[PDB]
Amino acid sequence: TPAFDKPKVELHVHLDGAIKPETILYYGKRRGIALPADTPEELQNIIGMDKPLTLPDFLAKFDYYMPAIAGCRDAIKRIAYEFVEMKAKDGVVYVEVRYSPHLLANSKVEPIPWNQAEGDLTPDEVVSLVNQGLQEGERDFGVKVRSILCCMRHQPSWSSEVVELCKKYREQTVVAIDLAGDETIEGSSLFPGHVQAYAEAVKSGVHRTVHAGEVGSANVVKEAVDTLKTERLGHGYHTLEDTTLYNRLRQENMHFEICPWSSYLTGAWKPDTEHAVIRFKNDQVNYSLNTDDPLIFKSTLDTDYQMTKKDMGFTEEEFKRLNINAAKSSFLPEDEKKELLDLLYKAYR
Ligand SMILES: [Zn+2]
């Protein structure tokens, strides 16, 4: 029994962090890729985490399975398709899924990811394949799906390509640009490559979100809002450390993409303190509930609702409230956004 058995909206979940272990296993053996384990259960046991890990340990989780998907057209399209199915099972009616097109390519991309051999899959084609999988999935599972392309903090050189891809495939699921990766990188938010890609997003009407304040200080949040001119914040928990910034963001109705289960497992949140989502609730902040990386966290969207319901006393009124706000803060055209809202209103009333 779901904690909130009603239609839901999810705005922060990574496609490369939401793959079925069986599918990883299928493609691993299909092209002779070495995987740590040969069974689904032990594979998620290895890939998943039950306790906070060092950043290196965390990032290494990806090294274990991404090589089996990246560079393979069939696989890129398939994980996108299966992703929509997963969300349908979660009772999600609208989802914005994000990922780095570069981390799935083996052609172009100077720093060829995952130590894979030079191939023939460019970031551009990756995007088209994802689009196809997501659209076929929308048709087959009844979930409205849009995507977001991720700039990687440690690779500013890819950021311009990211924004141009968002422009090229606009509406065809791509609705925004994101900035993900290691936030502890000093001045990463200020890297010219990232700043210019976002300045261009503003100029081309590409919506914007940025991972900030998850583990970094309130200062990375401030840089995301004032310099990158982000419209939403991924996590943004450390905004509570700069009261004036927090209050300005509340005044501006800034949207916070919260991932409760994730924040716990990663350690972004210390169990000894009030969870940010609790005060955001008390402060009536504009925020959403999200899984982030279901595969790595061994979770489903219900995991985050069960946690806030049972361990934080969230009411159905708050769940309805936050999903309405998630829809209001979506990067959907105003026309479709209103339709999504009408669905939620009728479903919540
Ligand atoms: Zn994320």
Active site residues: 214
Q: Could you give the number of structural domains in the chain?
A: 1
- Cα 257 to Cα 36, 88, 101, 304: the distances in Å are 32, 20, 21, 13
Orientation of helix 218-226 relative to helix 243-251, angle to 10°: 40
Backbone angles phi, psi at 237, to 5 degrees: -55, -40
CATH of the domain at 228: 3.20.20.140
- Cα 206 to Cα 158, 165, 259: the distances in Å are 17, 10, 24
Nearest CA to 19 among 133, 115, 116? 133
Q: Give the 3-state secondary structure of residue 4.
A: coil
Quote the ligand 1 centre to 291 CA distance (angstroms).
9
Q: Give the 3-state secondary structure of residue 229.
A: coil
> In this structure, what DSSP letter does residue 292 have?
B
14 among the known binding-site residues?
yes
Quote the ligand 1 centre to 13 CA distance (angstroms).
6
* Concatenated DSSP letters of 65-110: HHHHHTT-HHHHHHHHHHHHHHHHHTTEEEEEEEE-SGGG--SS-S
Quote the ligand 1 centre to 17 CA distance (angstroms).
9
Nearest CA to 233 among 255, 217, 203, 248? 255
| The two structure tokens encoding residue 156 | 């500013």
- Domain extent at residue 108: 1-349
Nearest CA to 306 among 293, 296, 291? 291
- Dist CA 194 CA 347 (whole Å): 40
Quote the ligand 1 centre to 349 CA distance (angstroms).
31
275 among the known binding-site residues?
no
Backbone angles phi, psi at 346, to 5 degrees: -65, -35
Resolution for this PDB entry, in angstroms: 1.8
Quote the ligand 1 centre to 214 CA distance (angstroms).
9
293 among the known binding-site residues?
yes
- Dist CA 54 CA 343 (whole Å): 42
| The two structure tokens encoding residue 96 | 């914005």
∠ CA(155), CA(160), CA(166), 5° rounding? 115
Strand partners, 97: 13, 147
Which residues sit with Cβ closer than 5 angstroms to ligand 1, an ion? 292
5 among the known binding-site residues?
no
Name, in order, each residue with C-beta under 8 angstroms of 39's C-beta and a sequence gap of 6 or more: 25
Do 327 and 336 meet the contact criterion of CB atoms below 8 Å apart?
Answer: no
- Cα 338 to Cα 185, 205, 229, 317, 335: the distances in Å are 39, 19, 24, 20, 6
- Dist CA 57 CA 54 (whole Å): 5
154 among the known binding-site residues?
no
Nearest CA to 151 among 96, 209, 203? 209
Q: How would you class 199 by CB atoms within 10 Å of its CB: exposed for 0-12, middle for 13-18, buried for 19 or more?
A: middle
| The two structure tokens encoding residue 18 | 């939401």
Q: How would you class 223 by CB atoms within 10 Å of its CB: exposed for 0-12, middle for 13-18, buried for 19 or more?
A: buried
